[PDB]
Write a protein that binds this ligand. Structure first.
Ligand SMILES: CC(=O)N[C@@H]1[C@@H](O)[C@H](O)[C@@H](CO)O[C@H]1O
Ligand SMILES: CC(=O)N[C@@H]1[C@@H](O)[C@H](O)[C@@H](CO)O[C@H]1O
Ligand SMILES: CC(=O)N[C@@H]1[C@@H](O)[C@H](O)[C@@H](CO)O[C@H]1O
Ligand SMILES: CC(=O)N[C@@H]1[C@@H](O)[C@H](O)[C@@H](CO)O[C@H]1O
Ligand SMILES: CC(=O)N[C@@H]1[C@@H](O)[C@H](O)[C@@H](CO)O[C@H]1O
Ligand SMILES: CC(=O)N[C@@H]1[C@@H](O)[C@H](O)[C@@H](CO)O[C@H]1O
Ligand SMILES: CC(=O)N[C@@H]1[C@@H](O)[C@H](O)[C@@H](CO)O[C@H]1O
Ligand SMILES: CC(=O)N[C@@H]1[C@@H](O)[C@H](O)[C@@H](CO)O[C@H]1O
Ligand SMILES: CC(=O)N[C@@H]1[C@@H](O)[C@H](O)[C@@H](CO)O[C@H]1O
Ligand SMILES: CC(=O)N[C@@H]1[C@@H](O)[C@H](O)[C@@H](CO)O[C@H]1O
Ligand SMILES: CC(=O)N[C@@H]1[C@@H](O)[C@H](O)[C@@H](CO)O[C@H]1O
Lengths: 403, 403
């Protein structure tokens, strides 16, 4: 398994553990701790549409451990900078939050959701998350120096920027993933003609980009942003991140075989591709371990419901099959109104299914083998409801509040 | 609130948090992680009646953080010494476990459940647990030197031991509690004629015993082990442990000044004592914060049900009253078959009620003011299920696996 950060899933969730619900709703942050008696509570009256003036169009809202206690904190990139509400480890979050650095904000540094990416990750393997942003002139890192002291925002690499050179959210992808196995997140960029790796130097800097694959890109295979989603994930169990994507004809995989260098692209699954009806606008696909393997499996929310193809263990896959007649288009699920995730909720290393639906937060549990049990309702909260939880003005994530 | 270690409750549980179930069953350690879909899993095939030859009459089985990751490990004092299964932070524990010191065991130092006490505590406040034993010649300490290296068992104090001067499990009480207010756990011992305290110096050693109270003892006020239970708990909210006991006429307390000097011994509740029918054999009593204000409240499982008396905040109390018609003698609950605990299950700092009954593990939830809702079944698991979970051959504890 690898700890991986993408654009669509910027909060890493443990392959084996009990994912918690974090909702940035209209009136504040609402926590649904994974627990025997689920009870959402308004934890912080901030970070919200109607409390603090937070907008999905201008701001980024996340969870990460900023103090090192192993407890996840609320983190938001607002106007004047980054704001942190600390988790005190006794189920209470600081309110009001503290502004921890005057950078990475809409007014401080001119960060834009339409041009730039902002991530939180422990890239120095020190137990706290640093701030890393793919900004204008390239990658800017701010080191987390303990007790909410964030060092200067610093240009550590003159690449992968909107203006260094030409990186666009409508053409390219930029992820963090350990492609070498040293436990440090490296940079993976899908550019125009090459997947590039920028290795992690261990000290908050990354080395210059090196081309590793001549596929999976807008001008190298014809891979378009929405239509052909791409992923980084350990598909072999060697602890290093491989590459997999859903094309036209199905799922192509490039296996990592040199601690950061890649084998040739192969079609491993005859499905999940546009050729079989899969559409950016309708059918989210994911990579998750559904078998406790340490290897990633393919999960797709299709028309009739949930499809899955299981990794044998070596990056080859069993045929796709329907495992659950729910959470698909048939049952009213839409990308505009609802959220779906594939995360372990039961600590068995076998990812489960959670959907924030029309009126209910629904779930189906992995039987521990990649099959799923009946759809159960967790709570009325976090659902679209009118929508009190519209994606336009709210944000829901799964996250392990205990690391 | 003050973290405390007692003979009945050697494992500290968070007053605000989500306590997990840990059962040392017939076939191994069964983990019951506090989560939305409680799914007990056989975590380690050891530490058990029929896996490792672990017997309730010879051995001690606990949960403590022995590595400093904040994740509770499985620790057991067996025949040849102390064995640990490390918790890796992803809900898996090493199996088999490994021996970390050939001492403090039935055949390694002649340790006896009938004569000695063995505890795991972070007495040096270094983030991981030392081994503390009250043995033959006094208090033996083994320093957790990291990475499962443990220093030689060293006699740190010639007192509180079976042969120094004559401490007896049928006459006396030995607890760990921070009474002095310096954040370190002190030895609190109820001897013949006095309650003694031994100040934790901070370095792995303990100052000589000092008499602080002429009461609460077998030869000071007529306090008997079975019939008149005693506790240490923060009753005033200053983070400093006070003393409270269920006597004949009710509950008596002596309050801590904040630095280990104790005030008068006074009667604060007219109930919970032998005079009102409370018996060692039938009616377990606890101190837990049922209102989330950081001061301990009294809870007793009597004949008709659960009785409670609420702390005003300063060691004075409201009247006792019955809050729930269950978990009592009349409903079949017996010490010989069943387990009852009062712990926060929901993260609101208000202790809830959980009982391992004849056929089910049942729960009643605190409403946040010390009242309790309808009784719900959490699972068939961990219940007596005759006699899959008999107390003669199995051990159930509550604990916070994630700290
Ligand atoms: C979107 C944004 O930045 N909102 C912040 C709010 O969270 C914060 O509490 C306040 C500081 O007083 O400033 C507001 O502008
Ligand atoms: C979007 C972006 O890159 N903003 C950066 C800002 O964080 C930095 O402080 C400043 C000076 O180096 O340069 C800006 O371009
Ligand atoms: C959008 C894109 O792919 N840009 C890449 C750039 O990141 C990299 O530095 C360079 C290596 O020559 O190749 C460029 O064209
Ligand atoms: C978009 C979608 O749901 N595609 C599925 C395809 O993956 C599957 O192979 C087939 C089952 O026969 O049915 C199609 O509808
Ligand atoms: C869009 C949505 O939420 N669809 C759900 C469906 O998944 C579920 O099977 C059903 C019964 O709970 O309720 C529907 O509303
Ligand atoms: C009660 C006891 O000590 N049992 C231990 C067991 O935990 C261990 O796995 C085994 C192998 O060394 O040795 C046994 O004696
Ligand atoms: C029960 C007990 O105290 N046993 C101890 C043993 O742990 C220690 O190793 C030895 C030498 O100090 O002395 C014994 O009395
Ligand atoms: C059982 C008991 O109380 N023993 C105590 C001993 O621990 C203490 O060191 C001494 C102080 O004078 O008094 C003894 O009687
Ligand atoms: C076991 C018990 O209740 N003993 C108490 C004693 O603590 C108290 O000092 C005394 C006052 O007269 O009354 C006794 O009954
Ligand atoms: C052991 C027991 O249940 N004793 C209770 C006592 O605490 C209570 O004050 C009284 C009146 O409700 O009823 C007694 O039987
Ligand atoms: C000892 C025991 O488990 N007693 C329970 C009782 O508390 C519960 O109210 C009832 C209904 O579930 O079932 C009894 O057997």
């Amino acid at each position: 398994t690898s700890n991986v950060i993408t654009q669509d899933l910027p909060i890493p969730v443990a392959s084996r553990g009990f994912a918690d619900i974090v909702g940035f709703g209209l009136d504040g942050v609402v926590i649904g701790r994974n627990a025997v008696n689920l009870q959402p509570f308004l934890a912080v009256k901030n970070f919200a549409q109607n409390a603090g003036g937070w907008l999905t169009t201008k701001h980024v809202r996340l969870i990460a451990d900023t103090t090192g206690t192993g407890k996840g904190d609320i983190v938001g990139f607002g106007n004047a900078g980054v704001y942190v509400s600390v988790n005190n480890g006794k189920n209470t979050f600081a309110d009001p939050p503290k502004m921890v650095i005057a950078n990475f904000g809409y007014d401080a540094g001119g960060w834009r959701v339409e041009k730039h990416l902002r991530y939180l990750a422990d890239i120095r393997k020190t137990g706290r998350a640093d701030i890393i942003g793919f900004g204008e002139k390239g990658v800017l890192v701010s080191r987390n120096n303990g007790g909410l002291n964030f060092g200067p925002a610093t240009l550590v690499l003159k690449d992968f920027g909107y203006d260094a050179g030409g990186w666009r959210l409508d053409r390219h992808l930029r992820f963090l993933a350990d492609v070498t196995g040293n436990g440090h997140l490296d940079i993976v960029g899908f550019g125009d003609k090459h997947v590039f790796i920028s290795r992690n130097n261990g000290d908050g800097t990354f080395a210059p980009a090196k081309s590793v694959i001549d596929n999976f890109c807008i001008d190298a295979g014809g891979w378009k942003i929405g239509d052909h989603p791409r992923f980084v994930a350990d598909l072999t169990g060697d602890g290093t991140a491989d590459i997999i994507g859903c094309g036209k004809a199905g799922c192509w995989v490039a296996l990592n075989n040199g601690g950061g260098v890649f084998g040739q692209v192969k079609l491993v699954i005859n499905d999940f591709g546009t050729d079989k009806g899969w559409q950016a606008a309708k059918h989210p696909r994911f990579i998750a371990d559904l078998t406790g393997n340490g290897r990633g499996d393919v999960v797709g929310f299709g028309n009739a419901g949930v499809y899955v193809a299981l990794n044998n263990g070596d990056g080859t896959f069993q045929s796709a099959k329907l495992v659950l007649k729910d959470f698909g288009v048939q049952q009213g699920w839409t990308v505009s109104k609802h959220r779906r995730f594939v995360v372990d909720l039961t600590g068995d290393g076998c990812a489960d299914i959670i959907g924030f639906g029309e009126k209910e937060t629904l779930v189906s549990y992995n039987d521990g083998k990649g099959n799923f049990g009946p759809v159960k309702a967790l709570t009325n909260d976090f659902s679209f409801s009118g929508g009190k939880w519209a994606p336009e003005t709210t944000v829901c994530w799964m996250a392990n509040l205990d690391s």
